[PDB]
Ligand binder design. Structure first.
Ligand SMILES: [Ca+2]
Ligand SMILES: [Ca+2]
Ligand SMILES: [Ca+2]
Ligand SMILES: [Ca+2]
Lengths: 128, 147
């Protein structure tokens, strides 16, 4: 299902977005990246909801670590398997990192805000 | 919105410039009228005011590029609203049963950087629950969002 051929691509396509080897990319380019990937790991646009729902952990500045991505991206392909548990070990062997939120936590915030902002208009305009 | 990529910010600048022919960085009602008359529409002087007024955020009688950007982004979030709403229901409706429970509100809703109370979620339902099943389906959810 997966090969070093595929892991060459990921690290090739990654350098484009993070040549400085920060081991991070901003959240707002995760959609772009997911698309620039090749098969099988690629997640073609529209892929917003897919990525959100991976519930990737984000450090500050809304940045996401290389490995956090690689794991969720391969999980999507291989599923929650034992062959995959083994893979999680191997390539995980091949810095400051304090996650403070997730993409699912971030999405709940945006939905909450949407709700609250829309409530405001409604609460007022049903008071003549 | 500051979710705008550079390409898009430039896109909107192309149009801001169409109007702002004196390059002073604001659009006057006059400059608005000029573009429109060039494109074959002849609106009133009052029509031009109201058009400037709706976008003017500071009441200085004209439109700078920040004010323009705000209006233009607001119009992009308009074309997605129907879906953005749908995809927000699916965020609350995690069991997928097409009904939103108190529990499902409680689980997602945040305000003043903390959870809501059981009493707060209860009323949110009570306000929206037209049919009275103590749950919120799409149609009820829509009416409570749309304007
Ligand atoms: Ca001008
Ligand atoms: Ca102004
Ligand atoms: Ca439900
Ligand atoms: Ca109901």
């Amino acid at each position: 299902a997966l090969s070093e051929d595929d892991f060459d691509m990921f690290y090739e396509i990654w350098e484009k977005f993070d040549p400085e080897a920060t081991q991070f990319i901003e959240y707002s380019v995760l959609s772009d990246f997911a698309d620039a990937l090749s098969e099988p790991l690629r997640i073609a646009k529209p892929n917003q909801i897919s990525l959100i729902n991976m519930d990737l952990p984000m450090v500050s500045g809304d940045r996401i670590h290389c490995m956090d991505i690689l794991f969720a991206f391969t999980k999507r392909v291989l599923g929650e398997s034992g062959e995959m548990d083994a893979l999680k070990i191997q390539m995980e062997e091949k810095i400051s990192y304090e996650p403070i939120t997730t993409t699912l936590r971030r999405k709940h915030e945006e939905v909450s805000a949407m709700v609250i902002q829309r409530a405001f208009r409604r609460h007022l305009l049903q008071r003549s | 919105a500051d979710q705008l990529t550079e390409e898009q910010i430039a896109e909107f600048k192309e149009a801001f410039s169409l109007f702002d022919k004196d390059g002073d960085g604001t659009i006057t009602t006059k400059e608005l009228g000029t573009v429109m008359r060039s494109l074959g529409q002849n609106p009133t002087e009052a029509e031009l005011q109201d058009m400037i007024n709706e976008v003017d955020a500071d009441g200085n009688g004209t439109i700078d590029f920040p004010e323009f950007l705000t209006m233009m982004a607001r119009k992009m979030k308009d074309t997605d609203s129907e879906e953005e709403i749908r995809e927000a229901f699916r965020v609350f409706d995690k069991d997928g049963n097409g009904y939103i429970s108190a529990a499902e509100l409680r689980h997602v809703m945040t305000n003043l950087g903390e959870k809501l109370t059981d009493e707060e979620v209860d009323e949110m339902i009570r306000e929206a629950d037209i049919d009275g099943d103590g749950q919120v389906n799409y149609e009820e959810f829509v009416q409570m969002m749309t304007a």
